């Protein structure tokens, strides 16, 4: 049994992180998100995965070949010279999925959840049709496309892009199980699968829906990145509670890499993930922030809800609030205030940013 993963294709959201490393390669709780997907994947038992990449991603080749060695599962590399979208990747690697008539996973990169792979297999064998979708609850139906579910079977009736009608609570969760007849239907053109191909096989009613129980987030967005980091540290608290780091000046669920350093007399608040090699200095308050690797946060700073990029240098008495994403190698000078500042990489900030704007 195989699995295709949709990755590359320049995530336009969280763009100050995407400009340096690719979107599946940025670290989500001291681990890349593609690592999360392929580790849970290999816990499922899939012997080889294929990931389909249109952006030329040589460090992705590099890390993925090293992790071919690390994991024990094979990894195949479908290479795309134009953007083929998200159905075109199935049709370019289509003979590798036509090798064996057995249902395959198709996964989106930007989703984090608790991954119920064998329960998905159990459901796809129970309902016995072409395609199975995963769905989830979202409180906000006016943001995402809804999918109507009848009870005790989970069959789709219709698939609706648009909100604001309230025909469903359930939202697509980015996990599909597809048969080879679905890939037989997919064509080479750069069309996306969920705009056209899922609509027609929802019109024939082949498509069925499986429900998660909890903890889902697509983190393609920086505020959704921070919310998914909060939910992942919740799930990590009541799954492996000895992996979160406990201390006297540590509040809530805090994940600290062993290479990270935390200074004296500082209050690391709730839902904080510090990367490898981070130097947190003396008297820094960090709540709800994700500090990626090699970033140094100097003394007496305050940080709430922030994405600090790789090799950053946040100065002294700096206040950062309102999801200000710093890119790679951003040097914030001392005694500044950043609110909403999406800062592009290799920037030096010497002025306060009082309202949300993009710094370039």
């Amino acid at each position: 049994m195989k699995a295709l993963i949709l990755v590359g294709g320049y995530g336009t959201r969280l763009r100050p992180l995407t400009l340096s490393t690719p979107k599946p390669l940025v670290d989500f709780c001291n681990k890349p998100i593609l690592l999360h997907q392929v580790e849970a994947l290999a816990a499922a038992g899939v012997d080889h995965v294929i990931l389909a990449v249109s952006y030329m991603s040589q460090v992705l080749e590099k890390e993925m070949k090293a992790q071919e060695q690390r994991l024990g599962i094979r990894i195949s590399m479908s290479h795309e010279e134009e953007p083929l979208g998200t159905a075109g990747p199935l049709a370019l690697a289509r003979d590798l999925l036509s090798e064996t008539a057995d249902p395959f996973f198709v996964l989106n990169s930007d989703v984090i959840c608790d991954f119920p792979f064998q329960a998905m297999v159990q459901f796809h064998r129970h309902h016995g049709q072409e395609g199975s979708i995963l769905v989830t609850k979202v409180e906000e139906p006016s943001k995402y496309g809804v999918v109507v579910c009848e009870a005790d079977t989970g069959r789709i009736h219709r698939f609706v892009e648009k909100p604001q009608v309230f025909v469903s609570n359930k939202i697509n969760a980015g996990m599909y199980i597809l048969s080879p007849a679905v890939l037989q239907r997919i064509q080479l053109q750069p069309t996306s699968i969920e705009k056209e191909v899922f609509p027609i096989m929802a019109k024939e009613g082949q498509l069925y829906a499986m429900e998660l129980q909890g903890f889902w987030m697509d983190i393609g967005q920086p505020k959704d990145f921070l919310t998914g980091m909060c939910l992942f540290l919740q799930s990590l608290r009541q799954k492996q509670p000895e992996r979160l780091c406990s201390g006297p000046g540590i509040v809530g669920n805090v994940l600290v890499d062993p290479s990270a350093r935390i200074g004296q007399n500082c209050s690391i608040g709730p839902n904080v993930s510090l990367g490898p090699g981070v130097v947190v200095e003396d008297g820094v308050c960090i709540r709800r922030c994700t500090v990626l690797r090699d970033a140094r946060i100097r003394s007496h700073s305050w940080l709430e809800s922030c994405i600090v990029g790789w090799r950053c240098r946040v100065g002294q008495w700096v206040r950062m609030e309102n999801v200000t994403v710093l890119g790679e190698d951003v040097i914030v000078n001392d005694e500044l205030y950043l609110n909403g500042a999406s800062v592009l990489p290799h920037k030096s900030i010497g002025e306060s940013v009082p309202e949300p704007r993009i710094i370039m």
Partner: protein, 406 residues
């Protein structure tokens, strides 16, 4: 024998100083650590032959004013008396109403100083220019920008005799780049025109600029003395910060023991910093340029203080950044809180210095200026107060940006 008349205002004149003037009178507000008319009393007591310093205003005598009068009489070895007017009589009506107390003992001349100015106070140069020429009115004037002069009282003079030929208090057009500093030297003869003005009001309230200076200009009675020293007008509450900056620069020559130095068991210090001896500052704090600390102020560890005035009794907790702010009496700022203002100075030489109206607003929007905390204002932990005015005895709970918190 010389005298000095410091025209302090009253409670109506201090309303523009409002969040700081709610507890103490605007003349007794400490700029660079000492109250703002103690600079005038300091400079007048340095003049040889100065017998008396009179303060004319319509404040009622309460405990801060009388305590200041006793402390100034003990410190400067001079009688400092407060003459309270029965009504607000303007800038010249208090001089005319108290003419018998001013001319008592027959002084050679008497200075007239507006209490809201920050100057280097060149009273000896002005006195000697007067002792050479002996005219009724001598004005102190300074050069200003062409755009800024429309805010102040412009003086058109003749450069040979230094005699003002025209005076307009707030002209809509440019008439002169020389502005009135609010420092005057009066002869006893100068109380003779004021009387005539008073009689023209009967056929009480005399404005010295509009009724006396503009009307007698060009007739040989008013003369100008021009200086290049520091000068500022303290009108709003945030102007006192710029006056504090100027006075701390003046302290390098005038009171070098008042500025704070680098001490191995003490805080880091950049620029000119005044710290009161009663104040306890932690050694991890750094106190940046133009910072004044009052008595009994506890400053925690890691506190950044830059371009600020911290009034007496205030507490800054740990890792608190305070920039361009005035922290009121007994007002407490919690840990990791940021009290920030935008620099706004009332200097007549800067072309895009602000136009200094009564309104703090523009198009509904509050203008970005000095953050002012009133007395006994509690700022909670990890909360930003940016460009805001907080009225006294207020306990905040969240961050406020660009507001007036009533």
């Amino acid at each position: 024998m010389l005298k000095a008349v410091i025209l302090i205002g009253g409670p109506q004149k201090g309303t523009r100083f409002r969040p700081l003037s709610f507890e103490v009178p605007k003349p007794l507000f400490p700029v660079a650590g000492v109250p703002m008319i103690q600079h005038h009393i300091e400079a007048c007591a340095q003049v040889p032959g100065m017998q008396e310093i009179l303060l004319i205003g319509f404040y009622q005598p309460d405990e801060p004013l009388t305590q200041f009068l006793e402390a100034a009489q003990q410190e400067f070895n001079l009688p400092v008396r407060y003459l309270q007017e029965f009504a607000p009589l303007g800038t010249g009506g208090g001089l005319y109403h108290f003419r018998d107390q001013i001319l008592a003992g027959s002084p050679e001349a008497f200075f007239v100083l507006n209490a809201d100015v920050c100057s280097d106070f060149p009273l000896s140069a002005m006195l000697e220019a007067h002792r050479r020429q002996r005219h009724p009115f001598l004005l102190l004037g300074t050069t200003a920008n062409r755009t800024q002069s429309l805010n102040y009282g412009c003086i058109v003079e003749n450069p040979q005799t230094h005699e003002v030929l025209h005076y307009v208090e707030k002209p809509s057009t440019f008439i002169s780049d020389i502005i009135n500093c609010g420092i005057y030297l009066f002869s006893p003869e100068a109380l003779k025109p004021l009387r005539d003005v008073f009689q023209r009001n009967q056929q009480g309230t005399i404005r010295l600029e509009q009724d006396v200076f503009s009307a007698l200009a060009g007739q040989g009675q008013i003369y100008v003395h021009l200086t290049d020293g520091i000068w500022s007008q303290i009108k709003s509450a945030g102007s006192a910060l710029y006056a504090s900056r100027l006075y701390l620069s003046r302290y390098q020559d005038t009171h070098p023991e008042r500025l704070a130095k680098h001490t191995p068991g003490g805080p880091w210090i950049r620029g000119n910093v005044y710290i009161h001896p009663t104040a306890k500052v932690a050694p991890s704090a750094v106190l940046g340029p133009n910072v004044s600390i009052g008595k009994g102020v506890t400053v925690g560890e890691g506190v950044r203080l830059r371009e600020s005035i911290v009034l007496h009794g205030a507490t800054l907790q740990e890792h608190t950044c305070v920039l361009h702010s005035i922290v009121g009496w007994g007002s407490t700022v919690g840990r990791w809180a940021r009290v920030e203002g935008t620099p706004s100075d009332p200097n007549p030489n800067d072309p895009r210095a602000r136009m200094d109206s009564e309104s703090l607003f523009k198009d509904g929007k509050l203008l970005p200026a000095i953050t002012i905390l009133g007395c006994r204002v509690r700022i909670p932990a990890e909360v930003l107060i940016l460009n805001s005015i907080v009225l006294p005895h207020k306990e905040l709970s969240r961050s406020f940006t660009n507001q007036i918190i009533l």
